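Teaching assistant's notes for section 4

Start the section by putting this record on the projector. Ask students to predict, before seeing the second block, whether TPR repeat will look compact or extended. Collect guesses on the board.
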Amino acid sequence: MVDQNPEEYYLEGVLQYDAGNYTESIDLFEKAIQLDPEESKYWLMKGKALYNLERYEEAVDCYNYVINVIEDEYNKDVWAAKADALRYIEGKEVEAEIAEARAKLEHHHHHH
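Reveal the predicted structure now:
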């Protein structure tokens, strides 16, 4: 499993849920990364925070970062997150559509 130093810091996951201060979680999040940057799953959370914070532009910076620094350009969850960001951006609307389709590309057939 993943065990270095930001294991206990996970306490954040609780703050946001319980403590309605997405902003506060930043303090803890910043520390987690400060310990050692290499966990993408941690960056994905940041995007949702920035996006929800009405920071569509800033949130995008995180999505591109995860794809820039790390060639992990495949994370379905990451692509989906970006779509939500575009779904509320001042500019082209065709972009949000491409994202939704790109993320929902996996589609599904016969659930049973």
